[PDB]
Write a protein that binds this ligand. Sequence first.
Ligand SMILES: [Zn+2]
Length: 359
Amino acid sequence: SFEGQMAEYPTISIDRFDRENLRARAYFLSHCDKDHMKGLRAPTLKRRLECSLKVYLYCSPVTKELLLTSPKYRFWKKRIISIEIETPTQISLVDEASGEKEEIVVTLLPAGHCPGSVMFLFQGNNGTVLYTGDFRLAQGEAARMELLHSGGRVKDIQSVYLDTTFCDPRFYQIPSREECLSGVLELVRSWITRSPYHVVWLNCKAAYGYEYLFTNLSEELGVQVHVNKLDMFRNMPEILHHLTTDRNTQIHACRHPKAEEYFQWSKLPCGITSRNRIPLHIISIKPSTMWFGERSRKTNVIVRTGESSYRACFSFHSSYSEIKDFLSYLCPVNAYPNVIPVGTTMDKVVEILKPLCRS
Ligand SMILES: [Zn+2]
């Protein structure tokens, strides 16, 4: 998968903070979530930050704000530097022992509709490289990123380190973000407008990136979404105001204690079953990735699984056709998969991408 270091600039570590990454001259975090924060508050990292004073963590403004709300990452406060989006920024990397000073320019590019998530474009004296993090771009979106271009052509990119979650031809097409949103919106609307006692449970994983779903549902329907915790958004009113910790609402995205089995659940996580002793009429909607082959047509983003249960198309990651389009456009020398899909291996994904690369 991806273990923190790009071959071209080994002294920087991205989205991985353990093992070899303990010797980084600079750290980068693409987005706030467990999978991309492995080792980020390990005692061995803290130990190393005490011995190495000029090492910083770089991320988007939103990611910095999110991280500083958590007591367990406050030790980073003095050492976290945000970089504005699409604002090429020079960073100095110093060898703590010797006197090797190394200069790189980093540009943050949007990755997809998820709070604070970015791609990092690095330009230095060993070529240009792109680290995508998790991403899903809109149609034609990469082509519109002026900072990926020079002289009306794409920049010469040596290596792209990219989200290959669905890098297999079986995952050829995934419904668009807009298609996914509209499907969920209209399902929720059809339910909660029936009476004040009709409520929806959005069954989401313990991860950021459902916020755009929550905010659009809230905006369109004039209802706040129930969540377990919203204090990470204390300084983000455009998100915060669409959310609530009060369970007296028609849209819920609360979560059971993570320990519990899916088969143990029999209600809303927060325990509300009635209002004015009138039973709530509840449907469950589970965001779930759905896809279609190259030669198939897309079908409904809403899949009914029971009298009161539904799956809804939703993806954090680009489809295979979107990956191909992105890499075809960027035309790098090398493409490195960051994720091996569960039904394959790392070497075989590298081979699927080889025809899009120059060498
Ligand atoms: Zn709830």
